[PDB]
Design a protein around this ligand. Structure first.
Ligand SMILES: [Cu+2]
Ligand SMILES: [Cu+2]
Lengths: 129, 129
């Protein structure tokens, strides 16, 4: 139907969705990230970052060096298709991006770039089929 | 009794012990850290760091800034009583420290300083008979 999806993140360092599908009828798509835990962002902040599967480790490594104030994502990172800000417990953030940045058939990776979270908080995104 | 203890770390970002007791008869205490998971040290490495409870956040912070080659511990950090190296799945490391560094009745914090791990990997250590 909709060109929107909600994904939850918690205090156990997990996302509640392992895969996300963007419908081909969509021109744009919005991701609503919710932090349903009760930990503060300095200890367990979460974001949602979308890249091609192969840019994962690099984006993460460099986001890590950008710091909390930069949402742990290097500014102007060309590898990042879209990202939310870092949020803490009881908060939410939304990000909308152009579906045309995506390529039918390709698997993209989405993950949390907060220090050390990428290993556990990761999933796959792609176009409908 | 004896002056040693074994603690396990896993791919779920947890330690298996929340408290450790050093017996008062000990002059030397040895901690054996085991990584029972299978993830690489760059993605889910673990260490064991001992500080006064107070110093947890600061040591964690500076440690993260020290980098993997420094085992995520600021070199010569004086707030650090003892620490292991950063290890990956299938490995183990041990550290032996002088009990005289601890003062009876005080609480000590032990935690993992690998980026972002300190929030879920923490325990208390105390001297007792
Ligand atoms: Cu996170
Ligand atoms: Cu760790």
């Amino acid at each position: 139907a909709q060109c929107e999806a909600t994904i939850e993140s918690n205090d156990a360092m997990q996302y509640n969705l392992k895969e996300m599908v963007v419908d081909k009828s969509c021109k744009q798509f919005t991701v609503h990230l919710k932090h349903v835990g009760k930990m503060a962002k300095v200890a367990m902040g979460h974001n949602w970052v979308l890249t091609k599967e192969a840019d994962k480790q690099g984006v993460a490594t460099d986001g890590m060096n950008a710091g909390l104030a930069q949402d742990y994502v290097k500014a102007g990172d060309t590898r990042v298709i879209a990202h939310t800000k870092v949020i803490g417990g009881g908060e939410s953030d939304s990000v909308t991006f152009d579906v045309s940045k995506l390529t039918p058939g390709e698997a993209y990776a989405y993950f949390c770039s907060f220090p050390g979270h990428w290993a556990m908080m990761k999933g796959t995104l792609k176009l409908s089929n």
